[PDB]
Design a protein around this ligand. Structure first.
Ligand SMILES: OC[C@H]1O[C@@H](O)[C@H](O)[C@@H](O)[C@@H]1O[C@@H]1O[C@H](CO[C@H]2OC[C@@H](O)[C@H](O)[C@H]2O)[C@@H](O[C@@H]2O[C@H](CO[C@H]3OC[C@@H](O)[C@H](O)[C@H]3O)[C@@H](O[C@@H]3O[C@H](CO[C@H]4OC[C@@H](O)[C@H](O)[C@H]4O)[C@@H](O)[C@H](O)[C@H]3O)[C@H](O)[C@H]2O)[C@H](O)[C@H]1O
Length: 124
């Protein structure tokens, strides 16, 4: 409360599925990139975005998981994803082996722009 993980403009264009790549407006490989946020903490993730709807992805390649979730809610161009959601989609709240974290847009006419991403710690 509060750990800034990104700021400034990032536009992503995405028309539909079934192509080559599904691009991200923001993404981390936590096995190689150092990361501020503590996953074992009880947390939420807030994203300031504009335009198309969005999803948050937590993925592990070797066990082949693709936890992908919608916002808990959205207010004033700010979405909110909780840990309860992520863990439920992931199958567990133990993220050892985690390969990939990303904010991705759904198929839209004219894409999305992310202005900021952050994390917050909570009192369970
Ligand atoms: O293990 C290989 C691994 O190596 C890494 O080095 C590499 O970077 C990884 O990309 C790669 O893993 C594969 O990633 C691709 C693409 O992932 C993106 O993010 C990672 C970036 O590196 C990369 O640049 C990006 O392109 C994944 O493909 C996507 O998979 C998701 C979800 O997983 C699907 O397949 C596995 C199965 O268990 C899931 O249930 C299934 O959903 C798909 O997202 C879903 O899309 C559907 C629409 O489906 C469409 O499929 C094909 C299309 O022709 C047809 O029209 C549609 O049916 C929506 O309904 C869902 O909302 C959504 O969840 C993407 O469509 C798909 O591109 C690979 O899964 C992964 O192996």
């Amino acid at each position: 409360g509060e750990i800034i993980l990104f700021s400034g403009s990032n536009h992503a264009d995405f028309k539909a599925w079934g192509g080559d790549d599904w691009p991200s407006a923001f993404e981390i490989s936590p096995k190689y990139e150092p990361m501020k946020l503590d996953l074992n903490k009880n947390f939420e993730i807030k994203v300031d975005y504009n335009g198309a709807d969005i999803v948050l992805i937590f993925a592990r390649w070797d066990k082949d998981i693709w936890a992908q979730i919608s916002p808990y809610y959205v207010v004033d161009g700010t979405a909110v994803f909780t840990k309860e959601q992520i863990a439920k989609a992931y199958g567990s709240d133990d993220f050892s082996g985690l390969d990939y974290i990303a904010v991705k847009p759904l198929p839209s006419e004219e894409g999305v722009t992310v202005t900021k991403v952050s994390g917050i710690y909570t009192n369970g």
